[PDB]
């Protein structure tokens, strides 16, 4: 089974958990600072629980409830399959969630084309990759340049395009 946390946010001297999972037997919760807990595992399905806070039977109103035919207000927990796997639980949580111009960084002003083999160029900073650089239009033809990385090697492509 998958471990489930039962935390009691609220005061008290003695706090116990009673549930469908343990045949409604009082289970004492451990207190750290001020809060009371119990990490026990439950089979994937429907479970009903209640708390015994200092001689009083209460349900956590922040958590979902279910009123019986007999008028028994108990807390309910639907332990889902997604709640056990980390990336499955984080995926369902993302789905559940439903000026002046920036000052130019100096990194972009640094080029690998201006600063031996003419084909060979220095390794560029990850930040200047995929950025478009161009040359002043002389003889009515535009020159464009950009550095792209393929696997672990870099390729700076020059395009001579007339305009």
């Amino acid at each position: 089974a998958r471990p489930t946390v039962f935390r009691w946010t609220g005061g008290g001297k003695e706090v116990y958990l009673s549930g469908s999972f343990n045949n409604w037997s009082k289970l004492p919760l451990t207190r750290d600072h001020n809060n009371f807990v119990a990490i026990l595992d439950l089979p994937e399905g429907e479970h009903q629980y209640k708390f015994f806070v200092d001689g009083q039977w209460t349900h956590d109103p922040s958590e979902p409830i279910v009123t019986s035919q007999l008028g028994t207000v108990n807390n309910i927990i639907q332990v889902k399959k997604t709640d056990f796997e980390v990336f499955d639980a984080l995926m369902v949580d993302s789905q559940k969630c439903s000026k002046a111009p920036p000052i130019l960084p100096p990194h972009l002003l640094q080029v690998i084309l201006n600063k031996c083999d003419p084909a060979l160029l220095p390794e560029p900073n990850h930040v200047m990759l995929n950025h478009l650089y161009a040359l002043s239009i002389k003889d009515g033809v535009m020159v464009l340049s950009a550095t792209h990385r393929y696997k672990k090697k870099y390729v700076t492509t020059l395009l001579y395009k007339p305009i």
Partner: protein
Amino acid sequence: GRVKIGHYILGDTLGVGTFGKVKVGKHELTGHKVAVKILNRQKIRSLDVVGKIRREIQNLKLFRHPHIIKLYQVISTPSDIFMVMEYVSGGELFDYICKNGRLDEKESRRLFQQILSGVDYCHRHMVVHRDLKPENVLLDAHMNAKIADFGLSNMMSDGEFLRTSCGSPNYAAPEVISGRLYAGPEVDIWSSGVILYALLCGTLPFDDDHVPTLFKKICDGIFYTPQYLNPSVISLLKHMLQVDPMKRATIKDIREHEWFKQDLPKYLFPEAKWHLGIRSQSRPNDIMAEVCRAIKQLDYEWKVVNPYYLRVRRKNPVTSTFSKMSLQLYQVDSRTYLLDFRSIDDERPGSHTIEFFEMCANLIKILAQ
């Protein structure tokens, strides 16, 4: 009456990090100790930090460096997420520097090397741990440094910058406190620089009770060098704590420095004018008004993210392939403003790189400078 997660009994609280509570965990049978970060799913969704945690877990799982706290396993419950990590007895490095005095040149170096080794491992894995302070550097039984709390850390994407002004003001880089766009590693170098000073002096290089003068002091990059400080380390601190990120030291520049190389153990480290886009001198809103009247004129679908950041798409007339590129208007000076063209990697066709140049050439031919 034992609180157990996995097979460890949860104990006392070690502290409270970026997004969660950290507790000790002693094994039911072996007595092995772990540090458990407890993240409440409902709380980590109240802040839109759900993606931040997904990435942090992904990264820390793949990592395995001797000076970075190891993430052993992640246990998910319907209520919370439990991050099981390695436990170190020695506690905070900050506390070591407090209870005991400043470290000697030998020990200061030893620990600085270990920290920088880990800081390098992070960068080499495109992970930039922002918020790098001696409070976040932990120590083991044998005095070994260990980088912890990757809560404020972010990824280093190709072509993209970072904006978040995260971490302690004393350790934050001038660009971080100025809220300017940064690449990533350069801000960790500044943090590593202040950690180094803290080790050698026992005090902070940039500190004042008055916050405005502290920020001035950081952006002025001026700090006191005590007489006991070795001029070689003073030259390292000067290079590391440079206000200008282009004049600032790199892990390579540090590796090469004389003071660093001394007694450095083997296990720690391995081993014709061009212009960026166009410069229109018009009003920032007037430039954005011109580009939208130009993007639609060339028949291209776009989605406005920021009043200065735009994402555009165009369908090929032959291959019918849709290619993407992003536009961003930066401020060069008080008088001049520049538009930036960045490629967006998609997912047989034509050619992604040349197709991107074709797009830009169209919009440049009908734009200023």
